Amino acid sequence: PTINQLVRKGREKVRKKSKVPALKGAPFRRGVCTVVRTVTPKKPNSALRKVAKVRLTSGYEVTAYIPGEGHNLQEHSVVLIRGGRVKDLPGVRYHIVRGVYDAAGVKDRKKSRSKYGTKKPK
Amino acid sequence: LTDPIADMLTRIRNATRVYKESTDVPASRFKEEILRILAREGFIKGYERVDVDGKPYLRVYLKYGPRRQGPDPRPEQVIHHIRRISKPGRRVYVGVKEIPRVRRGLGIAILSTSKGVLTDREARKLGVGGELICEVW
RNA sequence: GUUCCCGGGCCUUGUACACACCGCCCGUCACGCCAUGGGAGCGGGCUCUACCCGAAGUCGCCGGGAGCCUACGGGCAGGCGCCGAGGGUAGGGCCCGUGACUGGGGCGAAGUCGUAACAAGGUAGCUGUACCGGAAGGUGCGGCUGGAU
RNA sequence: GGCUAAUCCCCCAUGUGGACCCGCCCCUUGGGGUGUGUCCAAAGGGCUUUGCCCGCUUCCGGAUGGGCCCGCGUCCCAUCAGCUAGUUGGUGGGGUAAUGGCCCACCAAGGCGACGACGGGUAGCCGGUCUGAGAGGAUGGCCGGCCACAGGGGCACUGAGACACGGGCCCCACUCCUACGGGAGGCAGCAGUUAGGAAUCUUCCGCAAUGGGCGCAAGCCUGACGGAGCGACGCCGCUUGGAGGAAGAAGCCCUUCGGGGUGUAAACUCCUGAACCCGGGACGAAACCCCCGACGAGGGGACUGACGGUACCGGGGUAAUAGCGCCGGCCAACUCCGUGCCAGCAGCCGCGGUAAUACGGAGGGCGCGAGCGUUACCCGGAUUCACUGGGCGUAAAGGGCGUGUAGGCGGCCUGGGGCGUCCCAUGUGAAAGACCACGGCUCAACCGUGGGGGAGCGUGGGAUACGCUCAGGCUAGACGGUGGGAGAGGGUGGUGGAAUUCCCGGAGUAGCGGUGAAAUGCGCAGAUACCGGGAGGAACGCCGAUGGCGAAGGCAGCCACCUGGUCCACCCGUGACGCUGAGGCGCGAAAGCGUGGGGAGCAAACCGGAUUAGAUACCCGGGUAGUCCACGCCCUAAACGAUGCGCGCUAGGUCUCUGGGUCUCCUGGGGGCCGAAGCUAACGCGUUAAGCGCGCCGCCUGGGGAGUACGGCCGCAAGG
Ligand SMILES: [Mg+2]
Ligand SMILES: [Mg+2]
Ligand SMILES: [Mg+2]
Ligand SMILES: [Mg+2]
Ligand SMILES: [Mg+2]
Ligand SMILES: [Mg+2]
Ligand SMILES: [Mg+2]
Ligand SMILES: [Mg+2]
Ligand SMILES: [Mg+2]
Ligand SMILES: [Mg+2]
Ligand SMILES: [Mg+2]
Ligand SMILES: [Mg+2]
Ligand SMILES: [Mg+2]
Ligand SMILES: [Mg+2]
Ligand SMILES: [Mg+2]
Ligand SMILES: [Mg+2]
Ligand SMILES: [Mg+2]
Ligand SMILES: [Mg+2]
Ligand SMILES: [Mg+2]
Ligand SMILES: [Mg+2]
Ligand SMILES: [Mg+2]
Ligand SMILES: [Mg+2]
Ligand SMILES: [Mg+2]
Ligand SMILES: [Mg+2]
Ligand SMILES: [Mg+2]
Ligand SMILES: [Mg+2]
Ligand SMILES: [Mg+2]
Ligand SMILES: [Mg+2]
Ligand SMILES: [Mg+2]
Ligand SMILES: [Mg+2]
Ligand SMILES: [Mg+2]
Ligand SMILES: [Mg+2]
Ligand SMILES: [Mg+2]
Ligand SMILES: [Mg+2]
Ligand SMILES: [Mg+2]
Ligand SMILES: [Mg+2]
Ligand SMILES: [Mg+2]
Ligand SMILES: [Mg+2]
Ligand SMILES: [Mg+2]
Ligand SMILES: [Mg+2]
Ligand SMILES: [Mg+2]
Ligand SMILES: [Mg+2]
Ligand SMILES: [Mg+2]
Ligand SMILES: [Mg+2]
Ligand SMILES: [Mg+2]
Ligand SMILES: [Mg+2]
Ligand SMILES: [Mg+2]
Ligand SMILES: [Mg+2]
Ligand SMILES: [Mg+2]
Ligand SMILES: [Mg+2]
Numbered sequence A: 001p002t003i004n005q006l007v008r009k010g011r012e013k014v015r016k017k018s019k020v021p022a023l024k025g026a027p028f029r030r031g032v033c034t035v036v037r038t039v040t041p042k043k044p045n046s047a048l049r050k051v052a053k054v055r056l057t058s059g060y061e062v063t064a065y066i067p068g069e070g071h072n073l074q075e076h077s078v079v080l081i082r083g084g085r086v087k088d089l090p091g092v093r094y095h096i097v098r099g100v101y102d103a104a105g106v107k108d109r110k111k112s113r114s115k116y117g118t119k120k121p122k
Numbered sequence B: 001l002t003d004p005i006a007d008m009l010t011r012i013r014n015a016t017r018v019y020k021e022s023t024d025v026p027a028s029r030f031k032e033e034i035l036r037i038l039a040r041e042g043f044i045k046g047y048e049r050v051d052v053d054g055k056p057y058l059r060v061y062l063k064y065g066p067r068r069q070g071p072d073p074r075p076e077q078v079i080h081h082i083r084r085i086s087k088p089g090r091r092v093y094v095g096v097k098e099i100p101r102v103r104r105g106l107g108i109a110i111l112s113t114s115k116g117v118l119t120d121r122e123a124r125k126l127g128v129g130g131e132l133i134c135e136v137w
Numbered sequence C: 001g002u003u004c005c006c007g008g009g010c011c012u013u014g015u016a017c018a019c020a021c022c023g024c025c026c027g028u029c030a031c032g033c034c035a036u037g038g039g040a041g042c043g044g045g046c047u048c049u050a051c052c053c054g055a056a057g058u059c060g061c062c063g064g065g066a067g068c069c070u071a072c073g074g075g076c077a078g079g080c081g082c083c084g085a086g087g088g089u090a091g092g093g094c095c096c097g098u099g100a101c102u103g104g105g106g107c108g109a110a111g112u113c114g115u116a117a118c119a120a121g122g123u124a125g126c127u128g129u130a131c132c133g134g135a136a137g138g139u140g141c142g143g144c145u146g147g148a149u
Numbered sequence D: 001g002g003c004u005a006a007u008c009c010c011c012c013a014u015g016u017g018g019a020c021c022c023g024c025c026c027c028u029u030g031g032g033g034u035g036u037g038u039c040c041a042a043a044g045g046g047c048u049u050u051g052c053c054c055g056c057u058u059c060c061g062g063a064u065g066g067g068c069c070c071g072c073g074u075c076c077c078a079u080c081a082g083c084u085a086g087u088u089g090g091u092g093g094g095g096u097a098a099u100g101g102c103c104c105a106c107c108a109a110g111g112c113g114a115c116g117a118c119g120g121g122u123a124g125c126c127g128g129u130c131u132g133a134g135a136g137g138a139u140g141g142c143c144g145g146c147c148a149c150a151g152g153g154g155c156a157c158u159g160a161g162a163c164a165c166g167g168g169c170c171c172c173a174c175u176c177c178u179a180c181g182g183g184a185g186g187c188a189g190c191a192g193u194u195a196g197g198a199a200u201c202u203u204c205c206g207c208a209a210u211g212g213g214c215g216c217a218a219g220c221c222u223g224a225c226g227g228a229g230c231g232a233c234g235c236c237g238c239u240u241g242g243a244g245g246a247a248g249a250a251g252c253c254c255u256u257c258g259g260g261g262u263g264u265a266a267a268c269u270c271c272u273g274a275a276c277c278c279g280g281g282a283c284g285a286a287a288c289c290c291c292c293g294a295c296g297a298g299g300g301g302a303c304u305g306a307c308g309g310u311a312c313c314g315g316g317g318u319a320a321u322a323g324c325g326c327c328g329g330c331c332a333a334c335u336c337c338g339u340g341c342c343a344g345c346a347g348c349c350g351c352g353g354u355a356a357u358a359c360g361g362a363g364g365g366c367g368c369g370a371g372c373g374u375u376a377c378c379c380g381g382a383u384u385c386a387c388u389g390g391g392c393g394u395a396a397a398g399g400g401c402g403u404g405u406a407g408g409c410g411g412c413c414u415g416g417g418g419c420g421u422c423c424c425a426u427g428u429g430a431a432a433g434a435c436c437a438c439g440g441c442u443c444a445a446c447c448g449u450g451g452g453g454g455a456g457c458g459u460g461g462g463a464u465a466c467g468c469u470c471a472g473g474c475u476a477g478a479c480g481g482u483g484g485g486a487g488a489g490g491g492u493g494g495u496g497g498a499a500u501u502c503c504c505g506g507a508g509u510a511g512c513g514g515u516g517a518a519a520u521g522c523g524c525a526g527a528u529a530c531c532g533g534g535a536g537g538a539a540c541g542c543c544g545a546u547g548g549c550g551a552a553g554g555c556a557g558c559c560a561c562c563u564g565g566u567c568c569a570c571c572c573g574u575g576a577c578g579c580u581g582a583g584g585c586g587c588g589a590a591a592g593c594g595u596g597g598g599g600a601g602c603a604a605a606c607c608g609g610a611u612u613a614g615a616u617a618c619c620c621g622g623g624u625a626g627u628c629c630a631c632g633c634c635c636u637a638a639a640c641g642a643u644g645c646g647c648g649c650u651a652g653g654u655c656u657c658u659g660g661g662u663c664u665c666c667u668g669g670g671g672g673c674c675g676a677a678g679c680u681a682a683c684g685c686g687u688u689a690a691g692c693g694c695g696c697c698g699c700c701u702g703g704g705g706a707g708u709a710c711g712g713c714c715g716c717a718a719g720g
């Protein structure tokens, strides 16, 4: 632009766009599973990824991930979620926190147990 | 034509990039004051008021370095750099305290002050500020 | 004899191919997931206007067929009046949530149909517009080269 | 209903003084002074008692705390563009401490807005905090300042002060208690309960200190405050020991089975002594008061500690918690097994399909350490909104072209002013925080003392170069005269011939047409091919060009009229009159639309024939809109040089068009090619810049969704 143009129009400080809308300001959000199931991921991978359909306390009803081997979640299970998509599972933009509420930690994990809600074994 | 000074500095910058002996600029008491500093600080040999087809100009005698050995014989410049600061578009003034040091001392900054055209050094000695006309090295 | 069919050598030209033309790639139709527009309407928020009614309270008038106090050319009680929180009637404005159904959109994919584009892509391509066709598209008119030879 | 006191209310008196109206002087917005008139004061109590102490009254000054007013600064949406009836001003009154439409009556027709009014959204603002090299960005919790509010609203009363959190009246919503007749409440005080939430504390101790209120003083009140409790929430200090101790135990991991590793690590030896046990035990607190003196100056006296039997000081004394993330590249740390595109990992690129350092475990290793990781958000990296500090030929990006409004910007010389600008002197810029030094807690975190500033604004004085303004000159920019030139530049009106088609006369016979080859089609009802006549419409062959003209779209036979731009020479006239250009206004290829004409050729749609798997196409035969004319719409484009306009500067060769000269050639103005310097990611650009520079405008900010939706304006519709 010209200097004049800057005086007249100024530069435009463009806003940030939240990648965790359902969280609505919060670090975490509690919710309840309506639908628990497995869904096949996109190219170039194949699996049965574990997901929960959760109705939040913030009013949003979103699709959350169930990290780890095995779980106990079923319908009506209460759950806490945190941010973070699962790159390959489109529509999934949140993660369920293991070791919170009706979500038990992983059975038999020995490595990196905070990330999977597992107590320190004897 | 909207800027005499910017035209002036530019008439030179083109002339030095192809090593002309001189080049002429349309005359002004303000250009004489700037060429004066440009004379004394030794970026040019000097200048003289000539006349072209009935019209007043200033002929400016350019100054360069020595021939060089190598593929590019072209001698080093004396005015490596010359460019307006304050412009009609955006006037630029500095108080004494924020007067700049061009190129860690090895260059100059020309000024228009209420005491006359002065360099970064001079202005600091006299203690005055002014419109920062340009910078040279 | 080297035009034609297969294979190869050298120079050159186009390319969106490099998994290298047994390359790439376009749109409909079928299925599933997500978001969005429209939609008889339904529900909520805020707001504006006109008028009816109107508490407390200030202020103004009266204070007499008339009470109490006198400090009686007075005061208080008491009466009336204006504005007035808000309640009520009626019609408007912006926004939000939602709705049988509907329009295309994103993604998914191992589906169906054709092969429009990239080589002169086998009718050079793209283009605004217009009419038409299951779909990519075709054709008319004018335009561009970002078109091989 | 009845009595009673006072520092409770009222009348008279005194008038230092004050208030008010009228007059004069000074001043200069209602400030100071004075004269006539008028109005206004008051309270006692207590001791040691013809004397002091707490209080009372009127007035002036001070100090402190406020009210009101002005200049400047303060976020997002223009898809909110026009807003306003107490509205804007005047007059007269009401009201207050006081100005004022603050309020009322009357009078005038005004006030505000692209320098963003009105409207919608969001937020209490600042000192500061965080980040950042800075500029800037983000933010306003704690702490200090100001504001606003006290269940939701309205209102006043008492008062120096409130329209009053723990005061009042009313209305509403809500909850409660009841003896069922009625009445009460307001935690956004300190704790505490509940609800919501991912989430945020003890119904503690104390007036000892600091401070506040009442009081002569004692003293009383103080959930302010001083401390205590809980929470790794944060920062800081500290611990889980130190020295010795094998060519090196077992176990576990790896191995070529020789061995490598955990590892001085452990064991074990000596040394120290967190925790805990005993004794001492604070600083914080000397004032008020009492005493002599004088209830003062000064000197002396005693009482007072919630935290706390705590910190700390001294003696004794136990080897005394370690966890968490990571080891494909970024990025520091690698091996074995298990799995077999499964299970799973994932910030990005990517891992997993039988030898995975990337998944799960183990060994080993790397990083931190009462912590480590994760999620969320803020700045940084992002010169990725670019002021510092970016871009637009082909990557995202020049408006289709003009003309012009506001605005931004402007040639050479001289003077006045001194607005911007620079300097000096001064006031303000509180405290905490930041920074530098020092010092106190054993250090540190924390805290104390001092030091150094700044912008920015108020005032006084100075400076005059540049930008500003005013004034007076100039001719280099710009326009004009005079005289000429080239051109498909534009509008109107005419008119020429070539050719296609149809019709008419002639003459003539068996095919013509078309494609790759064919068919459809036309033809003995006489086609094609040929000669003559006629009708009508559209487009202009050769000239013609790598040409000319126009701002762009675009403009081509010829003739006349009307009209625009533009170049040249003379250097005659005006004297900066200039450049650009948000809005606005006009022009704007084709197609398309409206009303009316016209319709020869061509030809979307459509029909038929071929091709083909199909052929809603390409090829062939037909054919309607339309293509043409007038008037009025639409306003789009690969509207292109994918290159906004103007000006100045920076080698040349060559080809061409068009003026002028001293006609070899020189000089202007346009149109191409190659190239200096330079630019460029490269391709390429290069005096027709895409080079070096200035001014103003338009535009870009990852692909798709999408030139879509919604809103808005425009259009007959299409649609812009
Ligand atoms: Mg719930
Ligand atoms: Mg895979
Ligand atoms: Mg359950
Ligand atoms: Mg994340
Ligand atoms: Mg892991
Ligand atoms: Mg600058
Ligand atoms: Mg061959
Ligand atoms: Mg060969
Ligand atoms: Mg080849
Ligand atoms: Mg193929
Ligand atoms: Mg809807
Ligand atoms: Mg709707
Ligand atoms: Mg409704
Ligand atoms: Mg409604
Ligand atoms: Mg009514
Ligand atoms: Mg009323
Ligand atoms: Mg009476
Ligand atoms: Mg009354
Ligand atoms: Mg009302
Ligand atoms: Mg109402
Ligand atoms: Mg009511
Ligand atoms: Mg819907
Ligand atoms: Mg739908
Ligand atoms: Mg749908
Ligand atoms: Mg094709
Ligand atoms: Mg083709
Ligand atoms: Mg094609
Ligand atoms: Mg087309
Ligand atoms: Mg069909
Ligand atoms: Mg067709
Ligand atoms: Mg064109
Ligand atoms: Mg008595
Ligand atoms: Mg009296
Ligand atoms: Mg705006
Ligand atoms: Mg008003
Ligand atoms: Mg009135
Ligand atoms: Mg709001
Ligand atoms: Mg708020
Ligand atoms: Mg930076
Ligand atoms: Mg804030
Ligand atoms: Mg906060
Ligand atoms: Mg505060
Ligand atoms: Mg309130
Ligand atoms: Mg409440
Ligand atoms: Mg209330
Ligand atoms: Mg209230
Ligand atoms: Mg009082
Ligand atoms: Mg008051
Ligand atoms: Mg109160
Ligand atoms: Mg109150």
Ligand SMILES: [Mg+2]
Binding pocket: none
């Ligand atoms: Mg208040």
Ligand SMILES: [Mg+2]
Binding pocket: D165, D166, D187
């Ligand atoms: Mg309260």
Ligand SMILES: [Mg+2]
Binding pocket: D177, D184
């Ligand atoms: Mg009760």
Ligand SMILES: [Mg+2]
Binding pocket: D179, D181
């Ligand atoms: Mg009762």
Ligand SMILES: [Mg+2]
Binding pocket: none
């Ligand atoms: Mg009652």
Ligand SMILES: [Mg+2]
Binding pocket: none
């Ligand atoms: Mg209570």
Ligand SMILES: [Mg+2]
Binding pocket: none
């Ligand atoms: Mg809860």
Ligand SMILES: [Mg+2]
Binding pocket: none
């Ligand atoms: Mg609590």
Ligand SMILES: [Mg+2]
Binding pocket: none
């Ligand atoms: Mg606390």
Ligand SMILES: [Mg+2]
Binding pocket: D207
């Ligand atoms: Mg106290």
Ligand SMILES: [Mg+2]
Binding pocket: none
């Ligand atoms: Mg006292």
Ligand SMILES: [Mg+2]
Binding pocket: D221
């Ligand atoms: Mg008490």
Ligand SMILES: [Mg+2]
Binding pocket: D223
């Ligand atoms: Mg207490």
Ligand SMILES: [Mg+2]
Binding pocket: none
């Ligand atoms: Mg406290």
Ligand SMILES: [Mg+2]
Binding pocket: D247
């Ligand atoms: Mg050994």
Ligand SMILES: [Mg+2]
Binding pocket: D248
């Ligand atoms: Mg060893």
